[PDB]
PDB file of C-alpha atoms in Angstrom:
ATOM      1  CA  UNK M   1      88.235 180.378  63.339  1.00  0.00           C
ATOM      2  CA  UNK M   2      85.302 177.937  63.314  1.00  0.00           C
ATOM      3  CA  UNK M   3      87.478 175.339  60.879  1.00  0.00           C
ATOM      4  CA  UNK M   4      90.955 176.158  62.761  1.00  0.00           C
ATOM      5  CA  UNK M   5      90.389 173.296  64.940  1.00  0.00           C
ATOM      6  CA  UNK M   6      89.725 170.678  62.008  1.00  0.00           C
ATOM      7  CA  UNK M   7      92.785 172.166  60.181  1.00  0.00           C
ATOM      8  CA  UNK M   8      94.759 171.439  63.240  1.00  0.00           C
ATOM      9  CA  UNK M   9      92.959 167.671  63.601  1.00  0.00           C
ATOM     10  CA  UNK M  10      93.670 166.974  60.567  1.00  0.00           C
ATOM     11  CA  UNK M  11      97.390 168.374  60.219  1.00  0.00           C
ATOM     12  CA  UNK M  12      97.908 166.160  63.693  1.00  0.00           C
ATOM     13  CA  UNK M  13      96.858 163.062  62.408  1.00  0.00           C
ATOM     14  CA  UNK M  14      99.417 163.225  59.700  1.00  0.00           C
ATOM     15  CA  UNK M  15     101.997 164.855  62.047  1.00  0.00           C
ATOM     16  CA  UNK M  16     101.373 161.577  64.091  1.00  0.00           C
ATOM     17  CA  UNK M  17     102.195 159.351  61.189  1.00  0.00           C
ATOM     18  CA  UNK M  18     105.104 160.855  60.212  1.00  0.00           C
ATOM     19  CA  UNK M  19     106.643 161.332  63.317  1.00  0.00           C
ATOM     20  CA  UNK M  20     105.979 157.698  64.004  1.00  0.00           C
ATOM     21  CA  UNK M  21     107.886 156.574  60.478  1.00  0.00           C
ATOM     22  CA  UNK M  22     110.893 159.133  61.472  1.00  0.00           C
ATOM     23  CA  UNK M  23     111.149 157.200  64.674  1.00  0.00           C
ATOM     24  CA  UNK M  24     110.738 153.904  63.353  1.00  0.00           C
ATOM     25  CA  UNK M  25     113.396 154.957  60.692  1.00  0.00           C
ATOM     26  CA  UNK M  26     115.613 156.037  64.067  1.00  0.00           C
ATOM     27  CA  UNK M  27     115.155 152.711  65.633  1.00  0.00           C
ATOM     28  CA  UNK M  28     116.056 150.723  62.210  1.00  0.00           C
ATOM     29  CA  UNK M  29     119.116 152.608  61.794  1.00  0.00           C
ATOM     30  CA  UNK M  30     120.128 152.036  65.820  1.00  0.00           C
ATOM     31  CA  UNK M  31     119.385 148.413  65.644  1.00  0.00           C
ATOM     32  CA  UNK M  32     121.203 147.822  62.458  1.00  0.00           C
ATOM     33  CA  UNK M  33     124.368 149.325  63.509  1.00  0.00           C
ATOM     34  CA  UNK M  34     124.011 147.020  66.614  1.00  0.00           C
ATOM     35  CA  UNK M  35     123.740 144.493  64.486  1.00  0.00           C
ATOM     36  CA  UNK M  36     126.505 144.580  62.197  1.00  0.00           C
ATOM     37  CA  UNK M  37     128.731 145.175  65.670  1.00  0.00           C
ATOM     38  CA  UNK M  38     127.199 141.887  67.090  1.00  0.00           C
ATOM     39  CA  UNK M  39     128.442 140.190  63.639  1.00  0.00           C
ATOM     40  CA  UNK M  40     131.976 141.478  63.535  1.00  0.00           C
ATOM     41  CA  UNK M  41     132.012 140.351  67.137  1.00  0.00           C
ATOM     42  CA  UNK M  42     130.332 137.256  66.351  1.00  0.00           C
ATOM     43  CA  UNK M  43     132.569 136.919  63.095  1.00  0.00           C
ATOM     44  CA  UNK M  44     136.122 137.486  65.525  1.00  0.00           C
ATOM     45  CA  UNK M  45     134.888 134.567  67.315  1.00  0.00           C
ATOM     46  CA  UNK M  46     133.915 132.510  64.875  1.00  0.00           C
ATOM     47  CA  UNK M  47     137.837 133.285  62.958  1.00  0.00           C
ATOM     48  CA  UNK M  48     139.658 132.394  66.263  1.00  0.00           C
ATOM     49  CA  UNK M  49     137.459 129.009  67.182  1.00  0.00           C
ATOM     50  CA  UNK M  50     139.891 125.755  66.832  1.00  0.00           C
ATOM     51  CA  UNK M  51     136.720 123.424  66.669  1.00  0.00           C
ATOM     52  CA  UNK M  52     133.630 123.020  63.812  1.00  0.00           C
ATOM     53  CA  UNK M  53     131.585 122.205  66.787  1.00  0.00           C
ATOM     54  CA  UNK M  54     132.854 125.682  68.687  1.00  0.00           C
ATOM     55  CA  UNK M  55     132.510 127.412  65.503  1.00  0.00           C
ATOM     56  CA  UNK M  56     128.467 125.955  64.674  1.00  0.00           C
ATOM     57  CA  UNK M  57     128.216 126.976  68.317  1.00  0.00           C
ATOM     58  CA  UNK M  58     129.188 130.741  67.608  1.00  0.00           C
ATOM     59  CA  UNK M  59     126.739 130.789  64.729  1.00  0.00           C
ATOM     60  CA  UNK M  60     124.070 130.056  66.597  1.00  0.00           C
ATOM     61  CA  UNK M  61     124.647 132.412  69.449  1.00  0.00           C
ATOM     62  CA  UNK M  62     125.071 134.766  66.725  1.00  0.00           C
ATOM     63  CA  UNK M  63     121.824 134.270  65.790  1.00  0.00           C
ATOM     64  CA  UNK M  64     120.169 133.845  69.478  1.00  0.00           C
ATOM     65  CA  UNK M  65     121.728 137.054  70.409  1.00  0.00           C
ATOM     66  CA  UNK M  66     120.097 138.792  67.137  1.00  0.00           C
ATOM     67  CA  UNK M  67     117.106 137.963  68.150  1.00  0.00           C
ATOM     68  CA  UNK M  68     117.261 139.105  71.498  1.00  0.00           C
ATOM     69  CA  UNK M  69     118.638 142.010  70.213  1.00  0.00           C
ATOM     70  CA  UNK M  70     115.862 142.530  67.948  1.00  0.00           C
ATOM     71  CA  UNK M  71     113.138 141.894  70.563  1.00  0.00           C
ATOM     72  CA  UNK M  72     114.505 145.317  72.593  1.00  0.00           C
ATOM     73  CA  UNK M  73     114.506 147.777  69.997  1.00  0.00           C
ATOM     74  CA  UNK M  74     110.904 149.178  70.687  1.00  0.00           C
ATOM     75  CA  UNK M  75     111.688 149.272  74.789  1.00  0.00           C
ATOM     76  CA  UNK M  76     114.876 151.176  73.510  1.00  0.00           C
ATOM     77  CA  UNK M  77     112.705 153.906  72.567  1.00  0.00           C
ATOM     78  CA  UNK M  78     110.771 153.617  74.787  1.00  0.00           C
ATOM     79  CA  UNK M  79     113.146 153.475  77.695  1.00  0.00           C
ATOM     80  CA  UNK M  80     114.794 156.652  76.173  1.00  0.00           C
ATOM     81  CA  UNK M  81     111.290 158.811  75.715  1.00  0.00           C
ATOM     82  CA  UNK M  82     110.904 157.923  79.567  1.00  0.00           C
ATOM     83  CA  UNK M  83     114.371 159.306  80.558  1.00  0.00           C
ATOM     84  CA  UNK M  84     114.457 162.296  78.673  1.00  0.00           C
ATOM     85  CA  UNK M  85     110.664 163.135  80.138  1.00  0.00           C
ATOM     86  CA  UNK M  86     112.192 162.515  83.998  1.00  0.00           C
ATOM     87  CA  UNK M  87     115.090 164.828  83.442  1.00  0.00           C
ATOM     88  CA  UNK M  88     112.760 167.620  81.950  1.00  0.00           C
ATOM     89  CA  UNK M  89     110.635 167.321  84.699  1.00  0.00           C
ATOM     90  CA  UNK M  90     113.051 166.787  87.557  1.00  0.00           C
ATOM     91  CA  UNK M  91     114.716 169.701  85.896  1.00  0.00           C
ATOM     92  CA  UNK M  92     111.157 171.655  86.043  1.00  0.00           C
ATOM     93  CA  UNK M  93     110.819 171.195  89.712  1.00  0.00           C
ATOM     94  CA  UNK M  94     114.302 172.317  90.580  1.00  0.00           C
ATOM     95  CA  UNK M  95     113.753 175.290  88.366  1.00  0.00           C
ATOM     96  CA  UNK M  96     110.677 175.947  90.597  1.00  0.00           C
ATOM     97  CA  UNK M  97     111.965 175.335  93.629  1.00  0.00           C
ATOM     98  CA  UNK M  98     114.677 177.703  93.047  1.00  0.00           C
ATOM     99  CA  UNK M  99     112.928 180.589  91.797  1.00  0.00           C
ATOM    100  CA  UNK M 100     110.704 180.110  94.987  1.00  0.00           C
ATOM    101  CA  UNK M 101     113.730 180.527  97.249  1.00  0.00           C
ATOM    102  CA  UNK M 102     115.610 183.232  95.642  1.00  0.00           C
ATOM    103  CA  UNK M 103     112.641 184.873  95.558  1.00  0.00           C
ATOM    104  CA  UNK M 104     111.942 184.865  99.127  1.00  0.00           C
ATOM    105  CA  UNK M 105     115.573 185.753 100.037  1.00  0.00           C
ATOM    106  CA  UNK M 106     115.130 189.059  97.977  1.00  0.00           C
ATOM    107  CA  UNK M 107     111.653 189.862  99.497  1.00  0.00           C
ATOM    108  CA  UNK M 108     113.297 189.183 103.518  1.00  0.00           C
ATOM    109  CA  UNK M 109     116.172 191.649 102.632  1.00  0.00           C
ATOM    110  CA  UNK M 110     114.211 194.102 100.937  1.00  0.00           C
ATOM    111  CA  UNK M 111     111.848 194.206 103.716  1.00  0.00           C
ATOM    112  CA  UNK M 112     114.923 194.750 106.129  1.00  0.00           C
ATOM    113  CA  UNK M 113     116.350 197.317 104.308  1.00  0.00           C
ATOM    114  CA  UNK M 114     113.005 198.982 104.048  1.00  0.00           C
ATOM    115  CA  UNK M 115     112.387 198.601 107.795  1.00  0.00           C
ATOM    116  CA  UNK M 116     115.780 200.238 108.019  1.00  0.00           C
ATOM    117  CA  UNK M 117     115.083 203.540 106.055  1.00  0.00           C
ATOM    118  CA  UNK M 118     111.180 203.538 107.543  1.00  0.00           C
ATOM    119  CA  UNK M 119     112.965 203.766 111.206  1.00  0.00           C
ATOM    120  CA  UNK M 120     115.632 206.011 110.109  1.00  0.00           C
ATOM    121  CA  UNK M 121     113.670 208.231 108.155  1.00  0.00           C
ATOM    122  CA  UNK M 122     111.178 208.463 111.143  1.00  0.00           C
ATOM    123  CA  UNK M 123     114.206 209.424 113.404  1.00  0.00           C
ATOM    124  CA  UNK M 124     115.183 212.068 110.457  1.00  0.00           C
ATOM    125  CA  UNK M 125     111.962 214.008 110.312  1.00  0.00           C
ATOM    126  CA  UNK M 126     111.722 214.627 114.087  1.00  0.00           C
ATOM    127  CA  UNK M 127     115.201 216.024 113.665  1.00  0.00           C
ATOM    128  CA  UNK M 128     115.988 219.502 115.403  1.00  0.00           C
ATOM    129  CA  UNK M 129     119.128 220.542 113.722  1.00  0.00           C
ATOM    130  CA  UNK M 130     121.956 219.932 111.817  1.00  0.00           C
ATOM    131  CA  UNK M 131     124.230 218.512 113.670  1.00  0.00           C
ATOM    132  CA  UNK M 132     121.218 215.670 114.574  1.00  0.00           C
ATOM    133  CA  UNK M 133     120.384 215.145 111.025  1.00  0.00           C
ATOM    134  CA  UNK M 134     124.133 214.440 110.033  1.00  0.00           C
ATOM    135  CA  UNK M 135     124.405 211.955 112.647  1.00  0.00           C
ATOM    136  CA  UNK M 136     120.993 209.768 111.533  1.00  0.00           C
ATOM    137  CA  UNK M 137     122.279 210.169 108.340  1.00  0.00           C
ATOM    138  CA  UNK M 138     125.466 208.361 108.729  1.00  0.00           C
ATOM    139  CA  UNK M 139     123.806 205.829 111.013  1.00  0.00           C
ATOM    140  CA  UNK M 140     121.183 205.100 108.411  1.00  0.00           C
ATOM    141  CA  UNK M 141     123.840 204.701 105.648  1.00  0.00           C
ATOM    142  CA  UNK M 142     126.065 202.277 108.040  1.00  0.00           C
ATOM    143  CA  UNK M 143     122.881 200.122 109.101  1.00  0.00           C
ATOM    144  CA  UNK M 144     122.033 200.289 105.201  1.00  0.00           C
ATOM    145  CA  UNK M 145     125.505 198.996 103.936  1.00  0.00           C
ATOM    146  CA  UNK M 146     125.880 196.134 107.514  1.00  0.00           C
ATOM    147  CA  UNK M 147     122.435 195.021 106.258  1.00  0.00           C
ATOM    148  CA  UNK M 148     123.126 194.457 102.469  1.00  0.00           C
ATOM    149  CA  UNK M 149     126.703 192.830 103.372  1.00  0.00           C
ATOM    150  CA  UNK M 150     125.762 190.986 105.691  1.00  0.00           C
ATOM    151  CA  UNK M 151     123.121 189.340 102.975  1.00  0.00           C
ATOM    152  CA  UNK M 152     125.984 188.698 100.635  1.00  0.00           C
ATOM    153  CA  UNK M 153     128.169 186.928 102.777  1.00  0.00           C
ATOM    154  CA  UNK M 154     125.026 184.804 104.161  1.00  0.00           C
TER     155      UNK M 154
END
């Protein structure tokens, strides 16, 4: 217990590292497939140009472009860590939010319904006979079954 937290300090520093090589390794392997698709693009261009001038010219965008597309890799990540963390929490809230109201719903129509059988059983003990008993009865089932439909269809 007393050397679980240096275990743990030390297992996260090399966690760290090699979670940050795995996503360096992810970036690499993004940007290099960009890059050969900017070169066969690049390449198509240069194949169809009718000039050596318009040909140097679609070398060196070639290369302009691979540098720009080199400078964006790291904001790639990092523009994809920030999206996934808004959806998880927008996704969080909602979840929240919606427990919250379904909950309440079920507590207002379980409080009606019990308000219904409180009144109905109140009626039912004063009862003098039979024929007085039957009656709540039936009214206390009817009010049960208008409450609980009612709910559905709201």
């Amino acid at each position: 217990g007393s050397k679980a937290g240096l275990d743990q300090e030390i297992q996260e520093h090399v966690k760290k590292e090699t979670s940050s090589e795995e996503n360096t390794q992810k970036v690499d392997e993004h940007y290099a497939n960009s890059l050969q698709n900017l070169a066969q693009k690049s390449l198509e261009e240069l194949d169809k140009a009718t000039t050596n001038e318009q040909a140097t010219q679609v070398k060196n965008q070639f290369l302009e472009n691979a540098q720009k597309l080199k400078e964006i890799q790291p904001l790639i990540k990092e523009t994809n860590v920030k999206l996934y963390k808004a959806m998880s929490e927008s996704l969080e809230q909602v979840e929240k939010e919606l427990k919250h109201n379904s909950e309440a719903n079920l507590e207002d129509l379980v409080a009606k319904s019990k308000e219904i059988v409180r009144e109905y059983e109140g009626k039912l003990n004063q009862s003098k006979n039979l024929p007085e008993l039957k009656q709540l009865e039936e009214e206390a089932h009817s009010k049960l079954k208008q409450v609980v439909e009612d709910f559905r269809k709201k």
